Symmetry: C2
């Protein structure tokens, strides 16, 4: 079939959903595209190259709160951005694992730059803006990974028994959103303290 970048990525994302990240291979991608492997090689050199591109395209396609709204608070931007990021990672099987280890791509430079600049325009030093952004990303990635890897993996004292019931009651969104608010408020307490002991 068609082997331009867009179609190769379409097919690879479909495959990712079928196989997961560990089970995703260039060989299976070739088959899905109805081609021989040396034909695929011209287009996609190896799995790493493929994963790198998927990590970019999953956000490009499904992560639509990359930028603050006009006038939006930094609190609200981090919240909306974290929720968007979470949703995008959850959209494909092992999506968080696909993201893990990556760095912003040239195609994301202006987007991530803008976010860093935005934090600095709201009173954060680059450093603290970065630490806030990173903490949100890590918290979000950790939460999604827990959800996704638990699924893949598929007596009790009483609190643990009930804790496990609480976690088996929804997908993880409640715990995530509750933690997200704690995180953001913590950033605000820090930002507002300036040089005061806090």
């Amino acid at each position: 079939s068609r082997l331009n970048r867009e179609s190769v990525i379409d097919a690879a994302l479909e495959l990712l959903n079928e196989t997961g990240i560990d089970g995703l291979t260039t060989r299976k991608l070739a088959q899905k595209l109805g081609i021989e492997q040396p034909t695929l090689y011209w287009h996609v050199k190896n799995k790493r190259a493929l994963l790198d591109a998927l990590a970019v395209e999953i956000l490009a396609r499904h992560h639509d709160y990359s930028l603050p709204a006009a006038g939006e608070s930094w609190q609200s931007f981090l919240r909306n951005n974290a929720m968007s990021f979470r949703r995008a990672l959850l959209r494909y099987r092992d999506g968080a694992k696909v993201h893990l280890g990556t760095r912003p791509d040239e195609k994301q430079y202006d987007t991530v730059e803008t976010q860093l600049r935005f934090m600095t325009e709201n009173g954060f030093s680059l450093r603290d803006g970065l630490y806030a952004i990173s903490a949100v990303s890590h918290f979000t990635l950790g939460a999604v990974l827990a959800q996704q890897e638990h699924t893949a993996a598929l007596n009790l004292p009483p609190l643990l028994r009930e804790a496990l019931q609480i976690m088996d009651s929804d997908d993880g969104e409640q715990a995530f959103l509750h933690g997200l608010e704690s995180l953001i408020r913590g950033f605000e307490v820090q930002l507002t303290a300036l040089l005061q002991i806090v």
Copy 2:
């Protein structure tokens, strides 16, 4: 060589450091132990069984702040526990990935129960105690994974360039510890608010 549980786990942890999680296989474990695979099978049924045990034993061996000190504040316990947890996951290659997806083992029941009870004894509902514990775990796992998966994976606008320099300056501990304080303070703001709008 010797094939009691302790020695199999010793060998598998050494192998994990050599190969990483994806590259860890029962076949390579057999070789490292100088045995045939059907001999290993008697002892270890598959990779999943092996990973499950490694996840338990890495904490049992190296995660020594499982429990609060007498009189310790919940703030301090979460801090110490998160740092201990982080250190233990970092001790082996892909250690965070080994942990991911697991649930407490029967051998950890009393430990995790105690932590849940402890939170409840300091004013948290089981729910909120759990959400605090989970958020800490997810934040910690996300931070470690970022560090570990970045390593495995191994023009710029100016803030991104500097951000990347800041991140290439240390291992991730600074950003982690800064985020951890934000998280814990956020939990405290929530706990203290009770039914007040906050």
